[PDB]
Amino acid sequence: LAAVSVDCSEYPKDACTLEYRPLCGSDNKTYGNKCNFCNAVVESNGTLTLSHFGKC
């Protein structure tokens, strides 16, 4: 289907190192990883979504 979701249950903010992965939020936010995305998502209250992968 056409719907993605990054769970911060498998990738905690305490789990973000050499592993770098750019993402794009529905708000047009440029993330650097799932932690960065979950970080913003948390700030959204869980409303922020993932527009796509890579850089916005």
Curated annotation (Swiss-Prot):
Glycosylation site list: N45
Q: Which domain of life is it from?
A: Eukaryota
Q: Which residues form the Kazal-like domain?
A: 2-56
Q: What S-S linkages are listed for this chain?
A: C8-C38, C16-C35, C24-C56
Q: Where in the cell is it found?
A: Secreted
- Marked site: Reactive bond 3 for chymotrypsin, elastase, proteases A and B, and subtilisin: L18, E19
The Swiss-Prot or TrEMBL note on domains reads: Avian ovomucoid consists of three homologous, tandem Kazal family inhibitory domains.
Official protein name in the record: Ovomucoid
- Tell me which species this is from: Meleagris gallopavo
Shown residues within the full chain: 130 to 185 of 185
